[PDB]
Amino acid sequence: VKNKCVNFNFNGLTGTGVLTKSNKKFLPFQQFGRDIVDTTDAVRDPQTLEILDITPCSFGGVSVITPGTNTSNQVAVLYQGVNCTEVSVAIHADQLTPTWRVYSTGSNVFQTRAGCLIGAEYVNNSYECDIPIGAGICASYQTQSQSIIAYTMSLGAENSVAYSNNSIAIPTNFTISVTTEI
Amino acid sequence: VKNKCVNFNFNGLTGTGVLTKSNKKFLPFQQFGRDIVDTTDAVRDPQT
Amino acid sequence: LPVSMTKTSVDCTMYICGDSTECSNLLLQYGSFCTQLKRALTGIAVEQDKNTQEVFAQVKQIYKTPPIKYFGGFNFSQILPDPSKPSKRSPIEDLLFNKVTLADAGFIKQYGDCLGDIAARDLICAQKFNGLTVLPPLLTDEMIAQYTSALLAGTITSGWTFGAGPALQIPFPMQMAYRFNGIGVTQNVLYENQKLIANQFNSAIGKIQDSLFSTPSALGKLQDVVNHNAQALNTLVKQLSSKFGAISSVLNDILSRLDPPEAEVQIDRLITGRLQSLQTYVTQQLIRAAEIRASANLAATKMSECVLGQSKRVDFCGKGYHLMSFPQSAPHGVVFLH
Amino acid sequence: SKFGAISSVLNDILSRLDPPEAEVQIDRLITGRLQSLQTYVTQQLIRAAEIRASANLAATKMSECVLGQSKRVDFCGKGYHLMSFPQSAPHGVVFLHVTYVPAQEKNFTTAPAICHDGKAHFPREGVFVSNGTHWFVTQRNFYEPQIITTDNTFVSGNCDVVIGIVNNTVYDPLQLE
Amino acid sequence: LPVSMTKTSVDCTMYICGDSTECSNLLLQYGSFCTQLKRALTGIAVEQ
Amino acid sequence: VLHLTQDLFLPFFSNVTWFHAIDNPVLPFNDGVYFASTEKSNIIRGWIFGTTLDSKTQSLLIVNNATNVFIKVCEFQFCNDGVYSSANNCTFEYVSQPFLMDLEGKQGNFKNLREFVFKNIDGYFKIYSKHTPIIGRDFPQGFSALEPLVDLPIGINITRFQTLLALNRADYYVGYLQPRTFLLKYNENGTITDAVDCALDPLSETKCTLKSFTVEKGIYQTSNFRVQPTESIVRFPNVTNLCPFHEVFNATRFASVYAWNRKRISNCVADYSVLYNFAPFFAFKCYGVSPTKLNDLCFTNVYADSFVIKGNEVSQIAPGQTGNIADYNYKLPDDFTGCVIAW
Numbered sequence A: 001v002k003n004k005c006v007n008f009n010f011n012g013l014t015g016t017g018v019l020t021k022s023n024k025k026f027l028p029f030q031q032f033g034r035d036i037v038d039t040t041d042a043v044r045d046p047q048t049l050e051i052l053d054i055t056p057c058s059f060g061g062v063s064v065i066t067p068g069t070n071t072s073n074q075v076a077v078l079y080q081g082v083n084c085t086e087v088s089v090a091i092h093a094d095q096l097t098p099t100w101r102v103y104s105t106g107s108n109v110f111q112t113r114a115g116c117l118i119g120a121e122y123v124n125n126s127y128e129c130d131i132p133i134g135a136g137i138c139a140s141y142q143t144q145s146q147s148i149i150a151y152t153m154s155l156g157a158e159n160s161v162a163y164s165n166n167s168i169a170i171p172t173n174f175t176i177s178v179t180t181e182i
Numbered sequence B: 001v002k003n004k005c006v007n008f009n010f011n012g013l014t015g016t017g018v019l020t021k022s023n024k025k026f027l028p029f030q031q032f033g034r035d036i037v038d039t040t041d042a043v044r045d046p047q048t
Numbered sequence C: 001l002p003v004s005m006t007k008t009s010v011d012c013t014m015y016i017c018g019d020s021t022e023c024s025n026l027l028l029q030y031g032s033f034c035t036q037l038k039r040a041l042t043g044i045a046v047e048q049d050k051n052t053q054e055v056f057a058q059v060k061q062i063y064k065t066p067p068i069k070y071f072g073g074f075n076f077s078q079i080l081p082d083p084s085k086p087s088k089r090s091p092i093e094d095l096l097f098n099k100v101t102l103a104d105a106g107f108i109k110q111y112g113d114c115l116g117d118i119a120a121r122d123l124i125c126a127q128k129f130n131g132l133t134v135l136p137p138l139l140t141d142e143m144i145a146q147y148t149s150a151l152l153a154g155t156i157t158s159g160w161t162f163g164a165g166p167a168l169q170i171p172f173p174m175q176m177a178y179r180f181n182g183i184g185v186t187q188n189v190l191y192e193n194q195k196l197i198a199n200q201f202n203s204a205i206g207k208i209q210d211s212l213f214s215t216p217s218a219l220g221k222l223q224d225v226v227n228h229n230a231q232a233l234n235t236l237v238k239q240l241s242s243k244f245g246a247i248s249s250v251l252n253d254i255l256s257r258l259d260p261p262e263a264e265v266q267i268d269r270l271i272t273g274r275l276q277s278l279q280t281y282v283t284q285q286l287i288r289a290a291e292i293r294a295s296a297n298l299a300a301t302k303m304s305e306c307v308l309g310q311s312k313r314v315d316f317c318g319k320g321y322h323l324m325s326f327p328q329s330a331p332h333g334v335v336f337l338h
Numbered sequence D: 001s002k003f004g005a006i007s008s009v010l011n012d013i014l015s016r017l018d019p020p021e022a023e024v025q026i027d028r029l030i031t032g033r034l035q036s037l038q039t040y041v042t043q044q045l046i047r048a049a050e051i052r053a054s055a056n057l058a059a060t061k062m063s064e065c066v067l068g069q070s071k072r073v074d075f076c077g078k079g080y081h082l083m084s085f086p087q088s089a090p091h092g093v094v095f096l097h098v099t100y101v102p103a104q105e106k107n108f109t110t111a112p113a114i115c116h117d118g119k120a121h122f123p124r125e126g127v128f129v130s131n132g133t134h135w136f137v138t139q140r141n142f143y144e145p146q147i148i149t150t151d152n153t154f155v156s157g158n159c160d161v162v163i164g165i166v167n168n169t170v171y172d173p174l175q176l177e
Numbered sequence E: 001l002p003v004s005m006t007k008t009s010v011d012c013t014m015y016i017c018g019d020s021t022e023c024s025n026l027l028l029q030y031g032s033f034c035t036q037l038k039r040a041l042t043g044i045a046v047e048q
Numbered sequence F: 001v002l003h004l005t006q007d008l009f010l011p012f013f014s015n016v017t018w019f020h021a022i023d024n025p026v027l028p029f030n031d032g033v034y035f036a037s038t039e040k041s042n043i044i045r046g047w048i049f050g051t052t053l054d055s056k057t058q059s060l061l062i063v064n065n066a067t068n069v070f071i072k073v074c075e076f077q078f079c080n081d082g083v084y085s086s087a088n089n090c091t092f093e094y095v096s097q098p099f100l101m102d103l104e105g106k107q108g109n110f111k112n113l114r115e116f117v118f119k120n121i122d123g124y125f126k127i128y129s130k131h132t133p134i135i136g137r138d139f140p141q142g143f144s145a146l147e148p149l150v151d152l153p154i155g156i157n158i159t160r161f162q163t164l165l166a167l168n169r170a171d172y173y174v175g176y177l178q179p180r181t182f183l184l185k186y187n188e189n190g191t192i193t194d195a196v197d198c199a200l201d202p203l204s205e206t207k208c209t210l211k212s213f214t215v216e217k218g219i220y221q222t223s224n225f226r227v228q229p230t231e232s233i234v235r236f237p238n239v240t241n242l243c244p245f246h247e248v249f250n251a252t253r254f255a256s257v258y259a260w261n262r263k264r265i266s267n268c269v270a271d272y273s274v275l276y277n278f279a280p281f282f283a284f285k286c287y288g289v290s291p292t293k294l295n296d297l298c299f300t301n302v303y304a305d306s307f308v309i310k311g312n313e314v315s316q317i318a319p320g321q322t323g324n325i326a327d328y329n330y331k332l333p334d335d336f337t338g339c340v341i342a343w
Ligand SMILES: *[C@@H]1O[C@H](CO)[C@@H](O[C@@H]2O[C@H](CO)[C@@H](O)[C@H](O)[C@@H]2O)[C@H](O)[C@H]1NC(C)=O
Pocket: A172, A173, A174, A175, D103
């Protein structure tokens, strides 16, 4: 059973993950496979004499972005560092360790460079960051009537200077502003 | 003896401290009690 | 100057107990000796975010450079972003990106090709095997170039004004005359030797690129930070291959070979060893983060002083009487051009 | 936390077990508790070092922005720095930076120098600014136009190297008297 | 203002297991725990 | 205080089956069951517990009456309706204050709702209850705590659950508890004013991770997500190397006991199915291993001593025995780690 997470007990070695075809150049005497850091990577099939790699299961980390509970109860889920078509089929086949199942309406899918956001939708506008998601994406609570949106950073208001050969802007007035440093 | 540091052995539970009247609300099924960080704090008198 | 490092967000539960219910139960006796580690690592990640934001997000409005580039003979195409490059990056930043090879980029979603690695799985897949993951940075390495471009545009078309109030335009010749005036030389010298000084600037900007190209490692500080993080991570992963004084090094082997109440001693030994290794790694990460935060504060002060104005303090903005500086983005760092 | 022993409370374990078998469990408790204390003290040391760095920065900010005026940009508040008043805070300090920020600005015109009679004139302080018809001098962060006299400018040149030089007449209060 | 501290070059085997082969062997079972210490001490000397 | 505890609870917004009454199916018991019942005065007396509900395994009966209770852990035969017919192997009769408390404000509108929870971890039957005339429509929505009433060490096996009725001349709210981590909000008077599950909602996971009822705006890293393995493969080398067991049990001249032929079995895989299919055994007693546990243990060397002998001599052949065979022909050492096979 290849290309599927499965517990394997190859000739006494036990582990978890996904195995598939490989293009090693295994020497005939070789039986195991490893890497620089001494982790079992490739296993030769004892009953087929083919080469299969061993993969992690689904590694990532779930992060929840939420507004203040006194404001709203809607929440959105972040699946860090995973192509979330993988979790989409994982949610469908219901082999995910997380038991809380947040809705998937098709519009709440987000292939972020930093993982996948679920429970939020794109807004191609640009607003100042409220909650940092990562990979230049920020979520915030906004009125449509209220939901959780995800959008790219706006580094600031777009401004263009008027540099010229003989142009000077000289302030005719001034202001006094009192800020605070803590 | 209240208001006096004493070695107590209430119901096999050993320790040292001062016993005094408290205004807590122990349920009849409650026996030992505790505080925030897991230390035996208010032990109701088994007799009185 | 480095500004930040990669953000690691290890999970003790699995890093120590690979998908073992009994091992997780045994670890549960050690109290909150995990929430502390996770809190420390997330604090380090947030600290790195604030360091990069403090270093680069110094100006609110993102200025753009005028379409025509003739700043009195000063040639700025080597530091100005190149529209031909799809990443909108300057040629110098191109070399800075090319000369640094990251072992772990993080923004890879590498799951799906560890099975397809064909050859021996690399450091990243190996880390993904034993409870190690890297959180990609908030500020994408592209928008950092945009902030750098905005800062560069502010300091060559508006002088040092945009860091104080509204960005007021000023041509580069009299901006040059003023930076001269702040040192002790009258503007007549610049207005008499403008062609000579422009040729000097062009020659220097030509030579700096070749100096960065031909050197074996002049970016040795950023390479050093990356190598330190990678080496610490690799040692931390390798530590799971030590028996720590028990029968074997594999939890699923010990569990499946010995009975619970006798394998309890060995699994306790493994817990005490692996968790101590994780603690040491977290402490070293804390020290490195403190040093990098100090360097980032120094870099922020350097930016706001040298780039955003003329610094009277000697040797701070390069050796000699300082005139200006240009910022340039780098992987996990910044490069200044005094 | 039991730390892998019979119980997490010493005053019970000492009376529930005799010494020659209880010393092992109490040693487990000692090692766990002291490892936790080592973690706590290391974290406290790191926090104290960071607080010391912040305190040194705050002390420099005090002695610079309060006991004098800072020419450093973006150190004592955003913009040009004028003054600063300190305020005490719980386990910290709070500053009140008073900063000079310019205001409404207008394009006028500029020229690197003025050539009155074969000689290039440069402003002693400020730039040469033009309404559009009459050239003027002014300060840098405030518009205060002034008549171009021999006092505002110093003359040095030959009117053939300054690119963008602009023709106008300068004045002096000595020919008149 | 201090500028540097005394440079130290402590050694794993010589400090922990003075000339004991069995002790060194059982230290080898601890993995590369202490190579980190040697590298860190080299580092502190270098920064001094 | 906002104490967090992990113990077998009923999940929040879980699914509860609601029954009527006008025949009493035997609902399975596993990991406890939450029980609730609303009534005007009374239509329910008690419950019965255990497995197979007959006079073969110990059972339970907790019927109440007007003034006391009738808790008993006995081996009742059957009722099919004077509620038991057997008290032979029966003990531990428990009597206390009646569970059912009924109060009315001079009207039947104050229909009392009663929530009962039962569990059997390490024996020690725990009964939790709280009686109050709630709004009376159905299971309420406002939070209510449960106060344990009795905690008694049954120490028996329970698999199936059943309820008893009354006589006469809208209840049965049944839910199954699951092992989950919970956090409970304690009033300054000590009562539970609120509780949040930690396996239901992302917001619940966040509130649980920080053990607080108010979460400020921001991101919170709560746990790790895993694709659990769907199937489990076991694959071992293709080696078969069948042992000469075939030639030791297909022989035609099994030597006599006085000269017992001893075969050294080496360099083979000891599969015991070829042993199971070859002889309809009559004495397959083992001493150091289990007849069932033989294919999962690995051995250094195997000796197969084969000899045909009489019937009673089969029972004679055993460690620590005596007789004309056990003394002069073949003596089994008292510390023998192996098996004998007689057919
Ligand atoms: C410079 O800017 C000041 C405010 O930023 C101006 O002061 C204002 O004056 C108006 C009336 O002229 C008031 O109504 C207002 O409350 C404020 O005090 C100031 O006039 C301005 N100066 C110039 C020369 O433009």
